[PDB]
Amino acid sequence: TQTLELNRMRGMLEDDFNRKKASIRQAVKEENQQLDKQKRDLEKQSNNEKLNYERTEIDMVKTRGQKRP
Amino acid sequence: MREVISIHVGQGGIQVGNACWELFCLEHGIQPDGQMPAFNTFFSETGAGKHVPRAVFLDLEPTVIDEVRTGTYRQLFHPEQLISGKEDAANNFARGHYTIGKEIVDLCLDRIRKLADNCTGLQGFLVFNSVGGGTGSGLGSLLLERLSVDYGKKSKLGFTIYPSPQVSTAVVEPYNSILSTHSLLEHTDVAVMLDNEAIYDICRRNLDIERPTYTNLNRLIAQVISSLTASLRFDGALNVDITEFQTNLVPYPRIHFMLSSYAPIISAEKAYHEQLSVAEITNSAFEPANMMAKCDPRHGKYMACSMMYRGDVVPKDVNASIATIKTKRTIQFVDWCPTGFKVGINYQPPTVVPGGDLAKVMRAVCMISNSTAIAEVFSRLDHKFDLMYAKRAFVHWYVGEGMEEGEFSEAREDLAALEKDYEEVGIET
Numbered sequence: 001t002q003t004l005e006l007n008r009m010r011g012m013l014e015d016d017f018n019r020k021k022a023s024i025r026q027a028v029k030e031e032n033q034q035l036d037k038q039k040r041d042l043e044k045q046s047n048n049e050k051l052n053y054e055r056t057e058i059d060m061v062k063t064r065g066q067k068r069p
Numbered sequence: 070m071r072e073v074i075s076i077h078v079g080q081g082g083i084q085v086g087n088a089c090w091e092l093f094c095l096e097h098g099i100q101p102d103g104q105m106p107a108f109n110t111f112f113s114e115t116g117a118g119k120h121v122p123r124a125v126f127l128d129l130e131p132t133v134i135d136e137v138r139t140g141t142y143r144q145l146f147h148p149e150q151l152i153s154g155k156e157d158a159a160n161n162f163a164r165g166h167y168t169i170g171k172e173i174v175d176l177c178l179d180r181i182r183k184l185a186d187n188c189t190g191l192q193g194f195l196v197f198n199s200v201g202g203g204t205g206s207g208l209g210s211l212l213l214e215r216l217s218v219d220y221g222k223k224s225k226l227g228f229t230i231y232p233s234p235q236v237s238t239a240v241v242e243p244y245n246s247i248l249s250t251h252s253l254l255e256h257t258d259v260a261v262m263l264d265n266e267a268i269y270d271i272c273r274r275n276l277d278i279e280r281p282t283y284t285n286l287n288r289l290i291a292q293v294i295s296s297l298t299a300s301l302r303f304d305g306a307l308n309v310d311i312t313e314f315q316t317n318l319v320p321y322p323r324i325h326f327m328l329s330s331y332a333p334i335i336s337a338e339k340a341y342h343e344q345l346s347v348a349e350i351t352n353s354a355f356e357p358a359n360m361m362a363k364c365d366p367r368h369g370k371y372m373a374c375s376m377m378y379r380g381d382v383v384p385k386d387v388n389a390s391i392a393t394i395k396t397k398r399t400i401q402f403v404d405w406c407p408t409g410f411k412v413g414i415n416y417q418p419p420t421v422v423p424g425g426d427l428a429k430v431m432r433a434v435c436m437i438s439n440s441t442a443i444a445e446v447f448s449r450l451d452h453k454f455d456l457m458y459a460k461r462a463f464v465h466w467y468v469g470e471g472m473e474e475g476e477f478s479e480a481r482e483d484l485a486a487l488e489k490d491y492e493e494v495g496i497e498t
């Protein structure tokens with residue numbers, strides 16, 4: 001009975017340790033998923049901003065007609 | 070009570086040190102304010118919270134040190150450890166080793182002595198400088214002379230950003246690089262080549278950023294040096310001295326030119342797709358694609374290798390994986406080092422610097438090797454010198470300061486014997 005009381009100790013401790021480590025790994029996976037959104041969004045913002053700026057530049061250039069004094 | 074001193078001479082040194090101290094402040098919790106809401110290796114305490122880092126900053130061009138003086142870390146660095154002359158060096162050696170440098174190197178020595186008297190068990194020096202530079206080559210060589218003549222026992226681990234054999238930021242790099250090599254080879258014990266190109270290919274393959282900038286390369290170098298100091302910084306099952314490095318990695322008094330590698334370095338998505346086991350990571354660390362010095366190690370045979378692990382790293386799989394490595398076929402050691410590996414573990418997993426292209430990673434390994442492929446670099450570099458001295462080019466730019474010309478020959482001559490070195494030790498017996 002004592003050796004069973006102790007083997008269940010070992011078993012419970014190990015089947016808790018492993019679940020804890022797997023939880024840590026899942027948390028790291030979530031952290032990387034989160035980090036991905038930064039490079040997903042900053043690039044979108046910079047793309048839209050380049051679009052706006054270069055469109056405004058095209059406009060300002062094209063807005064040169066004739067003077068006719 | 071076991072600390073390091075870091076020096077950042079020149080332009081490359083000061084940039085990489087800027088990024089590296091950014092990383093260090095990030096790790097030890099020290100804020101840009103210098104207050105903190107483990108640091109005795111790098112930082113030091115001024116009685117009440119406001120800390121100061123152990124470093125000096127030398128670059129006679131007052132531009133980059135001004136970029137520091139006005140940057141986000143104006144409050145941290147000691148306002149006296151920011152020394153800069155009133156002119157530039159312009160990529161020739163004599164402009165930073167005979168005439169101009171003759172001014173502030175004494176100031177640097179005074180500042181270093183007044184830093185070291187406060188140290189308690191100072192272990193090693195860590196200079197940061199290019200050799201292709203003008204003030205990181207000459208002034209750095211003179212400072213190396215002064216250190217190796219005054220203190221002695223302390224190790225001197227320099228981290229020189231050599232220029233790649235292909236790309237070039239200047240056209241007079243061979244001269245003031247041969248000179249730097251020949252002037253340090255007698256006063257150093259470690260010199261890890263950090264090419265400025267292999268990291269570009271790395272960022273092109275592992276990180277998909279086709280357009281990387283000096284900032285990301287410096288972040289990576291900071292990561293390497295942090296993985297190195299992780300021993301002294303925080304504990305671990307295998308705490309290794311920095312004086313370990315000059316013991317495992319110095320076979321003969323003249324051949325002490327190591328090259329480093331870091332692993333893993335991946336983006337967020339790849340880490341999401343990858344396993345990153347100990348065996349996989351210590352296998353990838355040996356691939357040639359991630360050698361900081363642009364070489365092909367298969368061209369030669371290793372001599373020594375040291376590996377700093379950090380993170381969730383089980384030692385049994387460590388031993389198994391390194392055993393399998395030693396039984397792997399493509400690598401090759403030499404007869405006079407049957408004991409080739411050195412290991413050291415730490416429980417400080419790497420840091421995810423915000424915005425850094427590097428992703429959060431549980432495991433890491435930094436591999437510093439004394440190898441033989443690095444030898445051929447000199448050959449190709451010597452190549453350049455040939456075509457430059459076969460016409461006596463630019464010599465007048467050097468004699469127009471006061472450095473005797475014949476020195477060239479000597480320096481060149483030395484590197485010739487250097488090649489002989491790796492044909493006298495690399496040969497089996």
Ligand SMILES: Nc1nc2c(ncn2[C@@H]2O[C@H](COP(=O)(O)OP(=O)(O)OP(=O)(O)O)[C@@H](O)[C@H]2O)c(=O)[nH]1
Nearest residue numbers: 079080081084130157158159160202203204205283
């Ligand atoms: N990887 C990397 N290399 C750098 C960095 N900053 C400078 N370098 C290198 O520094 C070298 C340029 O030569 P300099 O160091 O500027 O020359 P100097 O010794 O400072 O002297 P002067 O420039 O004439 O005032 C090049 O090889 C650069 O690649 C950096 O932040 N990262």
Ligand SMILES: [Mg+2]
Nearest residue numbers: 080130158204
């Ligand atoms: Mg400069």
